[PDB]
Ligand binder design. Structure first.
Ligand SMILES: O=S1(=O)NCN(C2CC2)c2cc(CCc3ccc4c(c3)N(C3CC3)CNS4(=O)=O)ccc21
Ligand SMILES: [Cl-]
Ligand SMILES: [Cl-]
Ligand SMILES: [Cl-]
Ligand SMILES: [Cl-]
Ligand SMILES: [Cl-]
Ligand SMILES: [Cl-]
Lengths: 261, 259
């Protein structure tokens, strides 16, 4: 009766230990969600096996085939019992799996190369010298496409037509583009990743301004799962004990490479 | 039948309209949670009656009688169908009712009278000239009592023995104490209330420093309610539509008095 946990290789949530081939089972992995999985299992009284999602994806429903991919797909098609990963709580996912209460907060944020004269989305929207963009697919692009807020609508009208294209295929390319564009590119991405990169060498990026929306990561279990209630309560217990803040500090700042300000 | 909504008179969530005595039913009330109730009702397809919780409390279990008071009590004992209020998501409440996903974020924050040389909890912890405290019961006090974080442990060690007492019986008293202590008291309270008061005349308070923890308000229904799932999805839809942010800006900043 070992619980099958699906998760995803994304730093600092789940990472392969360099000597993983000499280790076995859950010991092959380390990270924020590795620690969280252990805490959840302890407070719910189950043993578990960590597995990495087969297709490396989070969870989206292909509009044509109507098939779920990623960790959500592994839940609804019965390949895993629970997903413990940086999986954003969204309406479409909530329809098909049960999300625990959030274990981490996040929102759209701005990444600049140190020295860029930008403090806010409003700053971005009122100037043209500094290009800015998003991942070419996903929720951040759609946030701007759909927004009725004047500043964000102005940003969307700019980004949708900017040339050369301000959209990037991957988060890594957005980050690289900030680092290599000599201050002439700002990247819009989730605050959690932005904060993580701010603590990575070469320590040349910064998160600026407040978050543009409010989201969270949640643990996912299939509907009717015998684990759902206990996991949900475990998340709240961990927060009230300060352990979620403790874990984020550990993996973002204690293990950071750029010191303080 | 008509859905019975229990809520609480707390500005700006639910307030009596100025002319409420001329009005009946749901029209007597205005505020963030009045607007949220209408949106939830619309997206879940029910009609509803707003009611103010009889005992004026949020929801706690008496350790001796084991009886739940407040809005949580009204749900578990069958007096109301749903609570739409600034009800903090907590473990012990989640054990007895169903919380929707959070519809507003909040965390512990610091309120000062403008001019007080305090910018952070760390600032508070290093001195005693400016007294500081919390509500005398509830989660903010317990956050400090239980913290193993050095700065917060230092603050607790001060607050627990400070004389005269730095604890207050009500949130209103904490706010009033800030305003009336001539710059010598700072109050630890939820960021949402701190932000609200900062936008109210006489515009003499300020929110300073980052939040000390991360919580949220949730809508509550009794376990097994036919409304739970629909309400939960409705909160996420409203968030993804930007409507929760729009409503907060409406009631905190558009209707603010301090520029
Ligand atoms: O997509 S949501 O579910 N819906 C919409 N919103 C917006 C407010 C409207 C949010 C906002 C957040 C951040 C604030 C928040 C709320 C509740 C809790 C939090 C953190 N924690 C903390 C560890 C992070 C623990 N458990 S908890 O008590 O439930 C997360 C998820 C969502
Ligand atoms: Cl990675
Ligand atoms: Cl091993
Ligand atoms: Cl310019
Ligand atoms: Cl606007
Ligand atoms: Cl009436
Ligand atoms: Cl510490």
């Amino acid at each position: 009766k070992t619980v099958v946990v699906t998760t995803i290789l994304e730093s600092p949530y789940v990472m392969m230990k360099k000597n993983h081939e000499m280790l076995e089972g859950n010991e092959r992995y380390e990270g924020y969600c590795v620690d969280l999985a252990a805490e959840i299992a302890k407070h719910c009284g189950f043993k578990y096996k960590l597995t990495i999602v087969g297709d490396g994806k989070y969870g989206a429903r292909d509009a044509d085939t109507k098939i779920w991919n990623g960790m959500v797909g592994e839940l609804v098609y019965g390949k895993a019992d629970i997903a413990i990963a940086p999986l954003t709580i969204t309406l479409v996912r909530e329809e098909v799996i049960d999300f625990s209460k959030p274990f981490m907060s996040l929102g759209i944020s701005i990444m600049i190369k140190k020295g860029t004269p930008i403090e806010s989305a409003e700053d971005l929207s009122k100037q043209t010298e500094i290009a800015y963009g998003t991942l070419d697919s996903g929720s951040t692009k759609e946030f701007f496409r759909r927004s009725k807020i004047a500043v964000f609508d102005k940003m969307w009208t700019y980004m949708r037509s900017a040339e050369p294209s301000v959209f990037v295929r991957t988060t890594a390319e957005g980050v690289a583009r900030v680092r290599k564009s000599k201050g002439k590119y700002a990247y819009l991405l989730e605050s959690t990743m932005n904060e993580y990169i701010e603590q990575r060498k070469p320590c040349d990026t910064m998160k600026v301004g407040g978050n543009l929306d409010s989201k969270g990561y949640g643990i996912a279990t299939p509907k009717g799962s015998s684990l759902g209630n206990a996991v949900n309560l475990a998340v709240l217990k961990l927060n009230e004990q300060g352990l979620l803040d403790k874990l984020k500090n550990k993996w973002w700042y204690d293990k950071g490479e750029c010191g303080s300000g």
